[PDB]
PDB file of C-alpha atoms in Angstrom:
ATOM      1  CA  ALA A   1     121.617  47.227  12.156  1.00 49.69           C
ATOM      2  CA  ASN A   2     120.692  50.786  11.014  1.00 49.61           C
ATOM      3  CA  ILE A   3     124.137  51.991   9.667  1.00 45.53           C
ATOM      4  CA  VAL A   4     124.836  55.862  11.325  1.00 45.89           C
ATOM      5  CA  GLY A   5     127.728  57.742  11.036  1.00 46.31           C
ATOM      6  CA  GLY A   6     129.522  58.186  14.455  1.00 45.51           C
ATOM      7  CA  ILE A   7     127.995  54.653  16.357  1.00 42.70           C
ATOM      8  CA  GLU A   8     130.291  52.151  17.313  1.00 41.31           C
ATOM      9  CA  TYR A   9     131.542  48.751  15.345  1.00 41.70           C
ATOM     10  CA  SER A  10     134.081  46.232  17.178  1.00 41.34           C
ATOM     11  CA  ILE A  11     136.572  44.621  14.815  1.00 42.68           C
ATOM     12  CA  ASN A  12     137.298  40.809  15.172  1.00 44.43           C
ATOM     13  CA  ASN A  13     135.947  40.768  18.439  1.00 43.78           C
ATOM     14  CA  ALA A  14     138.558  43.667  19.728  1.00 44.87           C
ATOM     15  CA  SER A  15     139.373  46.931  18.708  1.00 44.20           C
ATOM     16  CA  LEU A  16     136.350  49.553  18.820  1.00 48.04           C
ATOM     17  CA  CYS A  17     136.185  51.858  16.168  1.00 48.17           C
ATOM     18  CA  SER A  18     133.153  54.609  15.041  1.00 47.58           C
ATOM     19  CA  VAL A  19     131.280  54.361  11.545  1.00 47.45           C
ATOM     20  CA  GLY A  20     132.103  57.114   8.960  1.00 49.06           C
ATOM     21  CA  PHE A  21     129.559  57.112   6.452  1.00 48.65           C
ATOM     22  CA  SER A  22     126.745  54.784   4.607  1.00 47.95           C
ATOM     23  CA  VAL A  23     127.507  54.200   1.102  1.00 46.19           C
ATOM     24  CA  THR A  24     127.003  51.936  -2.226  1.00 46.78           C
ATOM     25  CA  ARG A  25     128.913  49.948  -4.293  1.00 47.61           C
ATOM     26  CA  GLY A  26     126.631  48.891  -7.058  1.00 48.93           C
ATOM     27  CA  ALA A  27     123.887  46.747  -5.095  1.00 43.43           C
ATOM     28  CA  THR A  28     126.702  46.191  -2.543  1.00 42.25           C
ATOM     29  CA  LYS A  29     125.963  47.899   0.946  1.00 39.70           C
ATOM     30  CA  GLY A  30     128.940  49.229   2.857  1.00 42.65           C
ATOM     31  CA  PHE A  31     130.513  52.111   5.336  1.00 40.49           C
ATOM     32  CA  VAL A  32     133.648  53.980   5.033  1.00 39.42           C
ATOM     33  CA  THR A  33     136.377  53.944   8.299  1.00 37.54           C
ATOM     34  CA  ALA A  34     139.602  54.378   9.131  1.00 38.83           C
ATOM     35  CA  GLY A  35     142.385  51.955   7.418  1.00 41.60           C
ATOM     36  CA  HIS A  36     143.977  51.248  10.976  1.00 44.46           C
ATOM     37  CA  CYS A  37     140.857  50.116  12.370  1.00 46.08           C
ATOM     38  CA  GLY A  38     140.893  46.887  10.365  1.00 46.60           C
ATOM     39  CA  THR A  39     142.861  44.653   8.302  1.00 45.99           C
ATOM     40  CA  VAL A  40     141.149  43.053   4.928  1.00 47.51           C
ATOM     41  CA  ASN A  41     138.517  40.376   5.891  1.00 43.16           C
ATOM     42  CA  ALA A  42     138.437  41.457   9.654  1.00 42.08           C
ATOM     43  CA  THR A  43     134.931  40.993  11.146  1.00 42.06           C
ATOM     44  CA  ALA A  44     132.444  44.163  11.840  1.00 42.67           C
ATOM     45  CA  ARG A  45     130.303  43.926  14.247  1.00 42.92           C
ATOM     46  CA  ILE A  46     127.577  46.292  16.020  1.00 42.98           C
ATOM     47  CA  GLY A  47     125.846  45.428  19.377  1.00 43.53           C
ATOM     48  CA  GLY A  48     127.502  41.718  19.419  1.00 43.43           C
ATOM     49  CA  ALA A  49     125.973  41.271  15.596  1.00 45.77           C
ATOM     50  CA  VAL A  50     128.138  40.481  12.689  1.00 45.86           C
ATOM     51  CA  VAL A  51     127.395  43.475   9.467  1.00 46.96           C
ATOM     52  CA  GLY A  52     130.043  42.778   7.024  1.00 46.81           C
ATOM     53  CA  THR A  53     134.082  43.183   6.398  1.00 46.35           C
ATOM     54  CA  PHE A  54     136.693  44.751   5.686  1.00 42.87           C
ATOM     55  CA  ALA A  55     136.747  44.910   2.038  1.00 42.67           C
ATOM     56  CA  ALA A  56     139.913  46.873   1.567  1.00 40.21           C
ATOM     57  CA  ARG A  57     142.152  49.364   3.171  1.00 39.83           C
ATOM     58  CA  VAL A  58     144.922  51.884   3.345  1.00 38.57           C
ATOM     59  CA  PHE A  59     147.213  52.254   6.195  1.00 40.61           C
ATOM     60  CA  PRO A  60     149.659  53.930   6.669  1.00 44.00           C
ATOM     61  CA  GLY A  61     150.427  56.243   4.057  1.00 40.18           C
ATOM     62  CA  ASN A  62     147.046  56.877   3.686  1.00 39.49           C
ATOM     63  CA  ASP A  63     144.272  55.783   6.438  1.00 40.15           C
ATOM     64  CA  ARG A  64     141.125  54.530   4.873  1.00 40.29           C
ATOM     65  CA  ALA A  65     138.694  51.577   4.288  1.00 37.04           C
ATOM     66  CA  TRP A  66     135.474  50.765   3.622  1.00 40.51           C
ATOM     67  CA  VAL A  67     133.426  47.558   4.949  1.00 39.78           C
ATOM     68  CA  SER A  68     130.801  45.547   2.792  1.00 39.46           C
ATOM     69  CA  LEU A  69     127.994  44.651   4.736  1.00 40.65           C
ATOM     70  CA  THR A  70     125.097  42.080   4.324  1.00 39.27           C
ATOM     71  CA  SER A  71     122.232  42.434   2.805  1.00 38.60           C
ATOM     72  CA  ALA A  72     120.295  42.849   5.710  1.00 37.47           C
ATOM     73  CA  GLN A  73     121.863  46.316   7.139  1.00 37.69           C
ATOM     74  CA  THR A  74     120.110  49.403   6.977  1.00 37.75           C
ATOM     75  CA  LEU A  75     121.928  52.306   5.487  1.00 39.56           C
ATOM     76  CA  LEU A  76     120.829  55.599   6.347  1.00 41.54           C
ATOM     77  CA  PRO A  77     122.306  58.861   5.151  1.00 45.20           C
ATOM     78  CA  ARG A  78     122.562  60.398   8.696  1.00 48.79           C
ATOM     79  CA  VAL A  79     125.344  60.872  11.733  1.00 46.80           C
ATOM     80  CA  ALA A  80     124.375  60.694  15.197  1.00 48.99           C
ATOM     81  CA  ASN A  81     124.300  64.202  17.216  1.00 47.94           C
ATOM     82  CA  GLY A  82     123.409  62.549  20.626  1.00 50.88           C
ATOM     83  CA  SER A  83     119.823  61.721  19.817  1.00 51.84           C
ATOM     84  CA  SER A  84     119.260  63.713  16.965  1.00 51.29           C
ATOM     85  CA  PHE A  85     120.617  63.223  13.304  1.00 52.91           C
ATOM     86  CA  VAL A  86     122.554  65.596  10.684  1.00 55.74           C
ATOM     87  CA  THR A  87     121.316  64.445   7.173  1.00 55.73           C
ATOM     88  CA  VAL A  88     124.015  63.834   4.606  1.00 57.50           C
ATOM     89  CA  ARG A  89     123.250  65.939   1.636  1.00 57.84           C
ATOM     90  CA  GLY A  90     127.189  65.320  -0.409  1.00 56.04           C
ATOM     91  CA  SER A  91     130.675  66.045   0.325  1.00 56.05           C
ATOM     92  CA  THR A  92     131.963  69.434  -0.518  1.00 53.83           C
ATOM     93  CA  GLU A  93     135.215  69.875   0.694  1.00 54.64           C
ATOM     94  CA  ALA A  94     135.205  73.030   2.719  1.00 55.27           C
ATOM     95  CA  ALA A  95     138.045  75.060   3.105  1.00 58.57           C
ATOM     96  CA  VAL A  96     140.312  76.271   6.248  1.00 58.73           C
ATOM     97  CA  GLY A  97     138.190  78.438   8.568  1.00 58.93           C
ATOM     98  CA  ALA A  98     135.076  76.373   8.131  1.00 59.64           C
ATOM     99  CA  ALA A  99     133.511  75.100  11.077  1.00 61.02           C
ATOM    100  CA  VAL A 100     133.392  71.187  11.134  1.00 61.50           C
ATOM    101  CA  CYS A 101     131.990  68.568  13.718  1.00 60.02           C
ATOM    102  CA  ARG A 102     132.806  64.996  14.082  1.00 60.37           C
ATOM    103  CA  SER A 103     130.504  62.345  15.672  1.00 58.35           C
ATOM    104  CA  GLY A 104     132.253  59.271  17.217  1.00 57.15           C
ATOM    105  CA  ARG A 105     131.424  56.585  20.131  1.00 56.89           C
ATOM    106  CA  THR A 106     134.193  57.963  22.521  1.00 60.59           C
ATOM    107  CA  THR A 107     133.550  61.758  22.746  1.00 59.98           C
ATOM    108  CA  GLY A 108     130.351  62.104  20.541  1.00 60.89           C
ATOM    109  CA  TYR A 109     129.594  65.033  18.407  1.00 61.97           C
ATOM    110  CA  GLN A 110     132.169  67.946  18.891  1.00 59.58           C
ATOM    111  CA  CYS A 111     132.271  70.889  16.374  1.00 59.04           C
ATOM    112  CA  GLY A 112     135.432  73.410  15.609  1.00 59.09           C
ATOM    113  CA  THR A 113     137.037  74.858  12.758  1.00 59.95           C
ATOM    114  CA  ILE A 114     139.111  73.063  10.062  1.00 59.94           C
ATOM    115  CA  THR A 115     143.107  74.869  10.348  1.00 61.56           C
ATOM    116  CA  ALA A 116     145.184  73.379   7.809  1.00 65.11           C
ATOM    117  CA  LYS A 117     145.443  70.878   5.235  1.00 64.59           C
ATOM    118  CA  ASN A 118     147.883  68.194   3.884  1.00 68.57           C
ATOM    119  CA  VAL A 119     149.188  67.690   7.114  1.00 69.40           C
ATOM    120  CA  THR A 120     151.587  64.075   7.526  1.00 66.43           C
ATOM    121  CA  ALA A 121     151.030  62.431  10.992  1.00 68.77           C
ATOM    122  CA  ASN A 122     153.615  60.735  12.087  1.00 71.10           C
ATOM    123  CA  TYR A 123     152.020  57.348  13.392  1.00 72.09           C
ATOM    124  CA  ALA A 124     154.195  54.397  14.944  1.00 68.07           C
ATOM    125  CA  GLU A 125     153.410  52.175  11.637  1.00 64.27           C
ATOM    126  CA  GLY A 126     154.768  54.949   9.597  1.00 63.47           C
ATOM    127  CA  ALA A 127     153.294  58.179   8.102  1.00 64.21           C
ATOM    128  CA  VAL A 128     149.977  59.211   7.121  1.00 61.53           C
ATOM    129  CA  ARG A 129     150.336  62.334   4.733  1.00 61.04           C
ATOM    130  CA  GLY A 130     147.232  64.475   3.156  1.00 59.40           C
ATOM    131  CA  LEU A 131     145.038  64.924   6.201  1.00 59.43           C
ATOM    132  CA  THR A 132     142.959  67.870   7.081  1.00 61.05           C
ATOM    133  CA  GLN A 133     143.159  69.059  10.538  1.00 59.83           C
ATOM    134  CA  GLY A 134     140.601  70.467  12.485  1.00 63.52           C
ATOM    135  CA  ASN A 135     140.083  71.299  16.466  1.00 64.59           C
ATOM    136  CA  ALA A 136     137.220  69.668  17.649  1.00 64.79           C
ATOM    137  CA  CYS A 137     138.481  67.603  20.089  1.00 64.81           C
ATOM    138  CA  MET A 138     138.141  63.633  19.944  1.00 66.60           C
ATOM    139  CA  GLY A 139     139.432  60.431  21.856  1.00 67.35           C
ATOM    140  CA  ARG A 140     140.828  57.023  21.156  1.00 71.60           C
ATOM    141  CA  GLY A 141     137.918  54.761  19.708  1.00 70.86           C
ATOM    142  CA  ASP A 142     136.343  58.323  17.234  1.00 69.36           C
ATOM    143  CA  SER A 143     138.932  56.890  14.832  1.00 67.65           C
ATOM    144  CA  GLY A 144     136.973  56.285  11.467  1.00 66.09           C
ATOM    145  CA  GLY A 145     134.102  58.332  12.942  1.00 66.16           C
ATOM    146  CA  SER A 146     132.525  61.395  10.683  1.00 67.30           C
ATOM    147  CA  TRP A 147     133.374  64.593   9.722  1.00 65.85           C
ATOM    148  CA  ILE A 148     130.724  66.653   8.482  1.00 62.63           C
ATOM    149  CA  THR A 149     129.526  70.556   8.156  1.00 62.83           C
ATOM    150  CA  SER A 150     126.191  71.317  10.145  1.00 61.19           C
ATOM    151  CA  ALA A 151     125.122  71.787   6.567  1.00 60.94           C
ATOM    152  CA  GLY A 152     125.625  68.061   5.662  1.00 59.49           C
ATOM    153  CA  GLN A 153     128.602  68.463   3.668  1.00 59.00           C
ATOM    154  CA  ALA A 154     130.739  65.288   4.226  1.00 56.73           C
ATOM    155  CA  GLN A 155     134.363  65.853   4.459  1.00 59.47           C
ATOM    156  CA  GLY A 156     135.965  62.709   6.058  1.00 57.97           C
ATOM    157  CA  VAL A 157     136.724  59.713   8.376  1.00 60.38           C
ATOM    158  CA  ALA A 158     138.814  60.423  12.003  1.00 59.73           C
ATOM    159  CA  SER A 159     142.068  59.337  12.074  1.00 63.07           C
ATOM    160  CA  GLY A 160     143.978  60.222  14.722  1.00 64.31           C
ATOM    161  CA  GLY A 161     145.153  63.033  16.935  1.00 62.95           C
ATOM    162  CA  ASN A 162     147.545  64.460  20.152  1.00 62.35           C
ATOM    163  CA  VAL A 163     146.279  62.858  22.965  1.00 63.13           C
ATOM    164  CA  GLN A 164     146.587  63.090  26.644  1.00 61.96           C
ATOM    165  CA  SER A 165     146.766  61.258  29.328  1.00 61.32           C
ATOM    166  CA  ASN A 166     143.184  60.983  29.903  1.00 63.32           C
ATOM    167  CA  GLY A 167     142.338  59.364  26.214  1.00 63.64           C
ATOM    168  CA  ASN A 168     141.107  62.391  24.365  1.00 66.45           C
ATOM    169  CA  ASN A 169     142.146  66.195  23.386  1.00 65.64           C
ATOM    170  CA  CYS A 170     139.240  67.275  24.905  1.00 65.98           C
ATOM    171  CA  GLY A 171     141.041  68.887  27.838  1.00 64.79           C
ATOM    172  CA  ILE A 172     143.090  71.179  26.002  1.00 62.99           C
ATOM    173  CA  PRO A 173     142.578  74.143  24.655  1.00 61.68           C
ATOM    174  CA  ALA A 174     141.087  74.351  20.948  1.00 60.24           C
ATOM    175  CA  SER A 175     144.424  76.506  20.202  1.00 59.84           C
ATOM    176  CA  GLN A 176     146.958  73.265  20.787  1.00 59.03           C
ATOM    177  CA  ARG A 177     144.457  70.451  19.749  1.00 63.07           C
ATOM    178  CA  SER A 178     145.906  68.558  16.127  1.00 66.12           C
ATOM    179  CA  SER A 179     142.311  66.428  15.513  1.00 65.20           C
ATOM    180  CA  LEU A 180     143.263  64.684  12.202  1.00 63.20           C
ATOM    181  CA  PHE A 181     140.525  62.898   9.333  1.00 60.47           C
ATOM    182  CA  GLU A 182     141.162  61.158   5.861  1.00 59.33           C
ATOM    183  CA  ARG A 183     139.527  63.796   3.215  1.00 59.52           C
ATOM    184  CA  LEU A 184     136.622  61.573   1.825  1.00 63.17           C
ATOM    185  CA  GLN A 185     136.863  62.275  -1.803  1.00 63.83           C
ATOM    186  CA  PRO A 186     139.676  60.523  -2.556  1.00 64.31           C
ATOM    187  CA  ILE A 187     138.165  57.074  -0.957  1.00 65.75           C
ATOM    188  CA  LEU A 188     134.864  57.458  -2.873  1.00 64.26           C
ATOM    189  CA  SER A 189     136.421  57.390  -5.947  1.00 61.11           C
ATOM    190  CA  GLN A 190     139.739  54.852  -5.195  1.00 58.79           C
ATOM    191  CA  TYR A 191     136.691  52.400  -4.324  1.00 56.84           C
ATOM    192  CA  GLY A 192     134.334  53.429  -6.968  1.00 58.99           C
ATOM    193  CA  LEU A 193     131.550  54.255  -3.788  1.00 62.77           C
ATOM    194  CA  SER A 194     128.809  56.426  -3.764  1.00 63.52           C
ATOM    195  CA  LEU A 195     127.552  58.132  -0.844  1.00 66.93           C
ATOM    196  CA  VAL A 196     124.051  57.610   0.391  1.00 66.19           C
ATOM    197  CA  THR A 197     122.656  60.998   0.886  1.00 62.33           C
ATOM    198  CA  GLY A 198     119.091  62.451   1.990  1.00 62.61           C
TER     199      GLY A 198
ATOM    200  CA  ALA B   1     150.495  62.205  16.670  1.00 64.97           C
ATOM    201  CA  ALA B   2     148.643  58.606  17.887  1.00 64.14           C
ATOM    202  CA  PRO B   3     145.797  56.345  15.583  1.00 65.21           C
ATOM    203  CA  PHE B   4     142.168  56.759  17.493  1.00 65.93           C
TER     204      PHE B   4
END
């Protein structure tokens, strides 16, 4: 399978999540995603084919994971934006006020701006601290997907937000949306990963 | 907030 940020993957033939970013760890290929998407050793599938398993995760507290993939997967420095792509150029963290976009299997590619950093989400499983908040909308299934600047600077992977009855926060005004992401920096250092870029 |  071609690994691009934003596409859908299922976990243990059950839950759906989105790919964050293509990465490597020495000769091992992988992608980073959301910790709540799977437990260590859960099986990841893309289009019905097995592509890898969860190698590690942290959730709650933080919300992060990396899946190591088989050798046959093709890592790409890209994030899906409809039919086109956003090239990954690095991981410079943007500041409050910067515009940002995110891509996921549920709402597609949405952009907004970063409104706050170091936010705590009180999920039913326990708190998740240090999240950054943006007002791009997102829905159930978007978790783990890519947060990136139009310029290609990777920001993080989707964690969660304030959902309405329709399964997303796209029907509410930007001013009231709270879409949270886990910063990428700490996941790269924690797992010793390197981003695939182009 | 809920996870996703």
